[PDB]
Amino acid sequence: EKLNEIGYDDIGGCRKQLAQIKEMVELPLRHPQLFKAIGVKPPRGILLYGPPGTGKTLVARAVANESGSFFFLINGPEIMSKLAGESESNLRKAFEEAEKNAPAIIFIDELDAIAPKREKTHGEVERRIVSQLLTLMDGLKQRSHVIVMAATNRPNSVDPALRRFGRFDREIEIGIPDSIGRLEILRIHTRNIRLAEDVELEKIANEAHGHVGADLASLCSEAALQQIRNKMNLIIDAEVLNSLAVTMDDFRWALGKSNPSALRETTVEVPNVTWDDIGGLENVKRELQELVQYPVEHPDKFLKFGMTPSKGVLFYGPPGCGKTLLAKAIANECQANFISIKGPELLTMWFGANVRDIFDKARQAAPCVLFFDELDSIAKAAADRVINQLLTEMDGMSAKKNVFIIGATNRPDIIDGAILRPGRLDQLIYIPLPDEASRVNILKANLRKSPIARDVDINFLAKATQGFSGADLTEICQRACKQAIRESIEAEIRAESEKKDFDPVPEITRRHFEEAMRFARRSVTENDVRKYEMFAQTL
Amino acid sequence: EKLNEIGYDDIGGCRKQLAQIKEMVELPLRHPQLFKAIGVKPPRGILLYGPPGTGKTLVARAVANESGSFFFLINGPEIMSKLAGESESNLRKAFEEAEKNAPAIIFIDELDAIAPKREKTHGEVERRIVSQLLTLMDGLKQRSHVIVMAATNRPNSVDPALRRFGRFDREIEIGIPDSIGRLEILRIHTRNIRLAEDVELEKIANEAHGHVGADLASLCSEAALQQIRNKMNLIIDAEVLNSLAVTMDDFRWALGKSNPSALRETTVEVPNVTWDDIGGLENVKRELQELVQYPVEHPDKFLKFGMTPSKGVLFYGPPGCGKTLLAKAIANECQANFISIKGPELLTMWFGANVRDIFDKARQAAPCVLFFDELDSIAKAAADRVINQLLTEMDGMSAKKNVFIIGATNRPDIIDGAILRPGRLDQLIYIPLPDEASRVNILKANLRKSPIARDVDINFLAKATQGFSGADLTEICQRACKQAIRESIEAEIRAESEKKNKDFDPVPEITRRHFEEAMRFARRSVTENDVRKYEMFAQTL
Numbered sequence A: 001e002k003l004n005e006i007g008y009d010d011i012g013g014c015r016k017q018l019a020q021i022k023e024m025v026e027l028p029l030r031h032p033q034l035f036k037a038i039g040v041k042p043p044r045g046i047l048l049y050g051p052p053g054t055g056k057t058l059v060a061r062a063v064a065n066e067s068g069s070f071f072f073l074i075n076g077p078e079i080m081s082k083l084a085g086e087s088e089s090n091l092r093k094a095f096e097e098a099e100k101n102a103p104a105i106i107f108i109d110e111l112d113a114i115a116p117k118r119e120k121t122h123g124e125v126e127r128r129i130v131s132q133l134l135t136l137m138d139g140l141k142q143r144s145h146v147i148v149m150a151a152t153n154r155p156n157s158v159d160p161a162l163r164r165f166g167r168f169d170r171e172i173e174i175g176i177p178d179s180i181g182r183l184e185i186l187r188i189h190t191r192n193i194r195l196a197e198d199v200e201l202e203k204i205a206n207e208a209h210g211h212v213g214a215d216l217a218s219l220c221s222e223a224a225l226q227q228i229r230n231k232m233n234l235i236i237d238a239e240v241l242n243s244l245a246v247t248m249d250d251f252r253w254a255l256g257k258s259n260p261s262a263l264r265e266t267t268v269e270v271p272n273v274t275w276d277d278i279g280g281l282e283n284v285k286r287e288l289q290e291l292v293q294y295p296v297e298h299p300d301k302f303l304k305f306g307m308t309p310s311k312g313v314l315f316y317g318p319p320g321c322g323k324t325l326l327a328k329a330i331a332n333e334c335q336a337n338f339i340s341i342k343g344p345e346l347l348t349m350w351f352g353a354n355v356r357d358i359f360d361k362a363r364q365a366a367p368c369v370l371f372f373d374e375l376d377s378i379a380k381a382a383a384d385r386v387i388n389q390l391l392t393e394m395d396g397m398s399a400k401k402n403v404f405i406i407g408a409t410n411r412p413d414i415i416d417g418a419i420l421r422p423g424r425l426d427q428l429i430y431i432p433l434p435d436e437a438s439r440v441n442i443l444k445a446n447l448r449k450s451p452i453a454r455d456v457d458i459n460f461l462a463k464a465t466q467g468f469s470g471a472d473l474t475e476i477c478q479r480a481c482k483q484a485i486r487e488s489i490e491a492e493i494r495a496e497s498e499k500k501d502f503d504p505v506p507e508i509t510r511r512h513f514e515e516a517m518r519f520a521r522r523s524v525t526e527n528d529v530r531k532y533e534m535f536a537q538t539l
Numbered sequence B: 001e002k003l004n005e006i007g008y009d010d011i012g013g014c015r016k017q018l019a020q021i022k023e024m025v026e027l028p029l030r031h032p033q034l035f036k037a038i039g040v041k042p043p044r045g046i047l048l049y050g051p052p053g054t055g056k057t058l059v060a061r062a063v064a065n066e067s068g069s070f071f072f073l074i075n076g077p078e079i080m081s082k083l084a085g086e087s088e089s090n091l092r093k094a095f096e097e098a099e100k101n102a103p104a105i106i107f108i109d110e111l112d113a114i115a116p117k118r119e120k121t122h123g124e125v126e127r128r129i130v131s132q133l134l135t136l137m138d139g140l141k142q143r144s145h146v147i148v149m150a151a152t153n154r155p156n157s158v159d160p161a162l163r164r165f166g167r168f169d170r171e172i173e174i175g176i177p178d179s180i181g182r183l184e185i186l187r188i189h190t191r192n193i194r195l196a197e198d199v200e201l202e203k204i205a206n207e208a209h210g211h212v213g214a215d216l217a218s219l220c221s222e223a224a225l226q227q228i229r230n231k232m233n234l235i236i237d238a239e240v241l242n243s244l245a246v247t248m249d250d251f252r253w254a255l256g257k258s259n260p261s262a263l264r265e266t267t268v269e270v271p272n273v274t275w276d277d278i279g280g281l282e283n284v285k286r287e288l289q290e291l292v293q294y295p296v297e298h299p300d301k302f303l304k305f306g307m308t309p310s311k312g313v314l315f316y317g318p319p320g321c322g323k324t325l326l327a328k329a330i331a332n333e334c335q336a337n338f339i340s341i342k343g344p345e346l347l348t349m350w351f352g353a354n355v356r357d358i359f360d361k362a363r364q365a366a367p368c369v370l371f372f373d374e375l376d377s378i379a380k381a382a383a384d385r386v387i388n389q390l391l392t393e394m395d396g397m398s399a400k401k402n403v404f405i406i407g408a409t410n411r412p413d414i415i416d417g418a419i420l421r422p423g424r425l426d427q428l429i430y431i432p433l434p435d436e437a438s439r440v441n442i443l444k445a446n447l448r449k450s451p452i453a454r455d456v457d458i459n460f461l462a463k464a465t466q467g468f469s470g471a472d473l474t475e476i477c478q479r480a481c482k483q484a485i486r487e488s489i490e491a492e493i494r495a496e497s498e499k500k501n502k503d504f505d506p507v508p509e510i511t512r513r514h515f516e517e518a519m520r521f522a523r524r525s526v527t528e529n530d531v532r533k534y535e536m537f538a539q540t541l
């Protein structure tokens, strides 16, 4: 009987959308007088879409329960699992009961099942039920106090006729939870499971990438199974039963063996790469501040001076110089959402229309940076369709919506000149090989989690490199760590053999870094650097 | 019960169409004696089409109510939601009840639902309804005084059989409202909502691009919701309730977060770019006047001299010289509609016939200037299909309908010579880099909204920038504005630091210094070689 007690606190990583739906639904159903007085018309149909398992199904019940409304549930499979007349009778009865017991919420859990695309019907009963649903949606009066909520995997799966301005006009996306949402879901799912004192659910939430709420429930279940195995493979005994608590190692094992279902779905989040970490690149700092931070933080100045900000940059520069991190940092300084799209991903999804989906999602998000990772794959100069999609979508993106498109290219001389036209992406910014401070910061980011020895002078390594790209520094650090692991394992084997300095190699010593450096080679030739300098004028 | 009172004043941005429909429907059904005497036959079927949310659904009721006729409504979803026999029984009862209570209007709301394309039926019950609808539409007796009206998203969706000369012969398009129509919509949706005295609804309309009437209802709803947020967050005191009025800052917030449904719908409007703003380019003014204005303003002299005007023009010149604006300006001087089509758009829509749709809309519009920007992406010399469609449409377009096709190209040498034949696009006009007079207006147009300091000599900059293209001038001003914003934001930060230690506006205008810095890095974007190449094209062809 927990259904009647499902509240907002019992739903996981949809805090922003939960607040939005609260404002949309609860307030009109709790204080109709205010909205009627001012004139606001509460929404008729709210469609929720997103990856499966997010928890969008519980949102309608939570809203109804905490607003005191009546809740009638319409399950698409249930209505489509009945005869030709009984399904229509059930739809009509649901709407009639909702009208009788207003204020009320009708929840169509699988709207895609009831009303798929008209091309997929291939029947008369299905089209009849679709038309009946349309009529009932039109039947509901503006002042009946019945709010029809719906859930679907993808909004494009619903018949377009249902998305008219009178039937389903508001669409809210319940996407993949962030780390805070993941922690909330894990806390919700562990209220009954007994947890050991050594579990840090924050770390588990931060590590689980691509995990939706159902995936986290599976994670907790598998962790409990692992604990039972550990305490049962050796051993029924009441004392042992009371000593059964999920330890952190069990959670780590479950996470390692967990195959999340939302790894392939794009993430929208505010990156935590503060510009204090990027270090130098201060010319790029100033340019990106002028191009992104000022339009978002101080719209008043732009309105005062009557300048429409340009919403398009191109990050051209040698490979492995942290263009993605620069985009993330400029997103963070503005507290702007960040969306990262790789060329292979776009081509693969096109092979499997979705160019407009990502821009629509960017519009959904608050002021955001839409970072395309390799634009030569799309703008080579099959791809002739994606290029035009992108160009037209940029040509239709109003400059006042605060969506900044930042495309990165290692090879800028191949990009089609159409993209670089004024008003599309005409803000060429050059990202050079990291300077001294940038190199120190790269080496410190690489060695953040690695215990280094005090004798190691990171500043000396940065000074010595003087030309290495970022990937080169990462390779140097990885070589040093590999040699350290090689020494640790050799010492462990020697200790085992001698059985017939508890930790002989606890930190990476200066010798490891020296040996790694001896074989280091520059990856960006001076000719390449000269070539990238001339592109600013060759265009 | 407001349905019985829906008039013409309660519908939004369809002022032109409503007047057209008023003559078509209200006048015959009000004075049948006059039309019968001369011999006019009032229309049988009027198919209203356009993007969703325009307000075409209320037109039938407004026409019926004002003319006193009987209004019987038919809903596509409703009829197709019933059994095989009841759906047909309702169609026949709708027309049977209409003839009984004539004069009357039958409004089919979703004609695409009842009568989709014959290839989409894939059933027997559905195909019986289509045929039943056809029979009823052909059973009207031209004296029954019953007028059928229909609404559809696109006319091509309807079964072609319904669009014969006896069933649905008149099609009226209710499209995206223009700025005046947006204000009509923004004033009918605000009759009940209380508004603050600081609200200038005219400004919101001119900024609401791509907003259909339904979308403008979301703006008002969102704007009022914003006011509740502001007052509720500060907070149900009755005094506060009476002080709840939508302020303009709320509207601007709503407009920023509003995602209009019709941003991708093409616009038909008369541009406001008067030729007095284009400045010079006077050798282009004479040629454009001889080809667009005189045929439209003075048809008499063309008939008197027996000359058929050439309906095609090609604009070729260096990039960023305001070719589009010149096309807009001549349209304004003729009060002609202007349709701008981009090369990328035509290919994108073709991948997703539509060439014939652009021309058909041009024909429906009053004397029109159909601009084809980037005609080098279509006439490159997939695309082979689009060029032929464009090539055939021009040939099949009678020169007497006052529709002019202007094609702008930055690279004319690539254009296929088929388009440049004497039949369709036979006139070439060269738009050069802006001259001294024009460069003054380009700078003025850019700095129209920007408060400039009196020490700035706009004339001096134009004299200095002899050779700069239009985009080069625009870049200079933006750099001036960009730098001006920087000195304003840094001054604010310095003020904050000084405030902690203890000229209201530090930089109120773009000083002469800001322009000086921008000009130093400014570089010409059209090489002297490129200018020479364009000159030789007139003879190379």
Ligand SMILES: Cc1cc2c(C(N)=O)cccc2n1-c1nc2c(c(NCc3ccccc3)n1)COCC2
Residues within 6 Å of the ligand: A273, A274, A277, A278, A279, A319, A320, A321, A322, A323, A325, A326, A434, A438, A439, A441, A442, A445, A446, A469, A470, A471, A472, A473, A474
């Ligand atoms: C771990 C790592 C690899 C890498 C690479 C690379 N091709 O291996 C390139 C650029 C930055 C890189 N970082 C890196 N990663 C981070 C930071 C940071 N700071 C310096 C920097 C940043 C952007 C840009 C330049 C230099 N650098 C600071 O934020 C945390 C992560």
Ligand SMILES: Cc1cc2c(C(N)=O)cccc2n1-c1nc2c(c(NCc3ccccc3)n1)COCC2
Residues within 6 Å of the ligand: B273, B274, B277, B278, B279, B319, B320, B321, B322, B323, B325, B326, B434, B438, B439, B441, B442, B443, B445, B446, B469, B470, B471, B472, B474
């Ligand atoms: C804002 C703007 C940008 C721009 C560009 C450009 N490459 O961005 C090219 C030509 C004119 C341009 N304008 C512009 N825009 C306007 C005007 C005007 N001056 C006269 C003119 C027109 C076309 C041509 C020459 C000179 N210039 C005057 O009418 C109002 C709008």
